[PDB]
Amino acid sequence: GPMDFVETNSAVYFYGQRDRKFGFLSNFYPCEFTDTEGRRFYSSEQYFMKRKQEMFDRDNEKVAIAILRAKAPAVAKKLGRQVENYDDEVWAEHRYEVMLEALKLKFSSDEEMAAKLLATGAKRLYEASRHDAIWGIGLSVASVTRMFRESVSFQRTGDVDAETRSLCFGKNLLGNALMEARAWLQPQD
Ligand SMILES: Nc1ncnc2c1ncn2[C@@H]1O[C@H](COP(=O)(O)OP(=O)(O)OC[C@H]2O[C@H](O)[C@H](O)[C@@H]2O)[C@@H](O)[C@H]1O
Numbered sequence: 001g002p003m004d005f006v007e008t009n010s011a012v013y014f015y016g017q018r019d020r021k022f023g024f025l026s027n028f029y030p031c032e033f034t035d036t037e038g039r040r041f042y043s044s045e046q047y048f049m050k051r052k053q054e055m056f057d058r059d060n061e062k063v064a065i066a067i068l069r070a071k072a073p074a075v076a077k078k079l080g081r082q083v084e085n086y087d088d089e090v091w092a093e094h095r096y097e098v099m100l101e102a103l104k105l106k107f108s109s110d111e112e113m114a115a116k117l118l119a120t121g122a123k124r125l126y127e128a129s130r131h132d133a134i135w136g137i138g139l140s141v142a143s144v145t146r147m148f149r150e151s152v153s154f155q156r157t158g159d160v161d162a163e164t165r166s167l168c169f170g171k172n173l174l175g176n177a178l179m180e181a182r183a184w185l186q187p188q189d
Pocket residue numbers: 027028045048052077080081082083084086088095132134135136174
């Protein structure tokens with residue numbers, strides 16, 4: 001509903017796989033794709049978590065199987081939080097590009113999903129997750145809605161300004177990765 005996203009002329013603030021319009025931007029959104037080696041994934045979430053286990057605990061049979069079986073994205077996530085030999089410095093260096101790969105597989109798997117991401121044009125994309133300030137901005141959709149309502153200027157440009165983003169928003173690695181996937185999906189002829 002209207003309380004589940006903010007959309008302006010220049011921005012989309014989304015959260016969650018359920019919204020009928022923007023649900024597809026969520027990494028929990030159900031889909032189906034295969035990697036080159038032929039493993040099957042049912043969300044971008046699950047693939048990202050498999051690549052985390054592969055990076056830190058590659059030979060762990062139980063954990064590899066459990067992630068490949070984790071069709072429920074929240075189960076994949078929790079397994080990902082439990083991956084052993086985790087090194088944050090190393091994951092922080094590599095995790096954006098892993099996510100961008102996940103998104104390339106996901107959006108490549110369905111032309112309708114691809115068309116939906118392209119239909120967002122050049123709008124800036126932000127995951128409005130209150131609890132995730134790495135993949136999202138660490139604010140809820142309601143919080144963002146109050147920022148807009150109290151600012152005639154955000155209302156005029158359709159987005160919060162860069163200084164505000166630098167002080168108020170988390171890293172939004174997902175929104176950034178989606179905008180890079182969207183660029184990658186642009187027609188080349
Ligand atoms: N195995 C681990 N052991 C230790 N700490 C960990 C571990 N994994 C994560 N951390 C800690 O958790 C932090 C974040 O780890 P990242 O893997 O980037 O993300 P996410 O696990 O939040 O999953 C993000 C996905 O799930 C959401 O739906 C999003 O939208 C994405 O799709 C690290 O910096 C560590 O502090």
